[PDB]
Amino acid sequence: SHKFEFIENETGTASITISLDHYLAKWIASHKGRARRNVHVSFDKQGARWTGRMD
Amino acid sequence: TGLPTYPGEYYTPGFLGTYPKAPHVVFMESPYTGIESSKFTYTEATDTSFVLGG
Amino acid sequence: IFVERVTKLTYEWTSDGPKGWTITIGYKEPEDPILKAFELIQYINSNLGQLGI
């Protein structure tokens, strides 16, 4: 599953629920592998783009 | 880089415990684990310079 | 292996015997969001006390 929220002039949040056998969930888990450690998402739909950083 | 050394309270009969020099306890989450439920959280660092005063 | 310190130990016993131990390894934020609200209110009341001095 996933969810994202846009708020006017305030911080919205998003979340993703994922299987551990997914090749991207293994990449989020391995901080050894990311030399540049921050993780960012973009959700794109109908010209709108939610973007944010992993807390 | 040397080989691990142990506190002298180890070796002593009837002792159990942790000193920070030599942690031993591992909770294995692999097959036949024994743990009832778990949550592991990782939180990233979120701040590059600090501003102070007033 | 991930290593850090045991910060919280909870024990529970009932008339059906022990429920065992809840162990927190490392510094987790309170699971109930309301206990995070009380934790921030403790921080404010200490700051609000020094501002009055």
């Binding site: - | 979120t46 | 699971e31 109930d32 969001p33 995070k36």
Partner: peptide, 22 residues
């Protein structure tokens, strides 16, 4: 059931991040 209170607790924890930070 405990799980339904736990699910709603987890949603409130993700929305509280609008209002707080480390």
């Amino acid at each position: 059931v405990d799980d339904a209170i736990a699910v709603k607790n987890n949603e409130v924890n993700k929305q509280a991040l609008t209002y707080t930070r480390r």
